[PDB]
Amino acid sequence: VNTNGVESQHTVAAYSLESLTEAGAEFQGNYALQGGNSYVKVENVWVRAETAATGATGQEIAATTTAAGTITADSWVVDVGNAPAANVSAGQSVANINI
Amino acid sequence: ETAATGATGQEIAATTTAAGTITADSWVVDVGNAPAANVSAGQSVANINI
């Protein structure tokens, strides 16, 4: 995702569609609302998203919604935060392997 | 073009600062101004330098 015009790679947790549809979520386009949490379909995997103006960094807009009964009308942005349950990174790169 | 002129949430192109005579704004790619005819090209035939 590009922030302020420069791209970067962020690791964020992913949620399966089956769990979302089992929990009783209301969907709209690429946007979902399971309840107190909101999700956007930026790619084939669903990710929790922040409402708007939280990062205040001009991040790429994940999706836009409308009334749709009980859906807030806002321009949603993928949550750059929301670290996974177990955030583990590779100790060394491929070119710096030391075992 | 400057920010708050597309009014669609378009992807931000670049952000600048003062740096002298440059206005600090979140510039965005100006959708529109399609290639128009009758515009000066690079060089003439007799002065081709590529």
From Swiss-Prot, chain A:
It comes from the Bacteria. Coiled coil: none annotated. It is found in: Secreted; Bacterial flagellum. Flagellin is the subunit protein which polymerizes to form the filaments of bacterial flagella. Homomer of FlaA is able to form a functional filament. Belongs to the bacterial flagellin family. This is Flagellin A. It comes from Rhizobium meliloti (Ensifer meliloti). The chain holds residues 199 to 297 of 395 of the full protein.
Swiss-Prot record, chain B:
Belongs to the bacterial flagellin family. Flagellin is the subunit protein which polymerizes to form the filaments of bacterial flagella. Homomer of FlaA is able to form a functional filament. The chain holds residues 248 to 297 of 395 of the full protein. It comes from the Bacteria. It is found in: Secreted; Bacterial flagellum. This is Flagellin A.
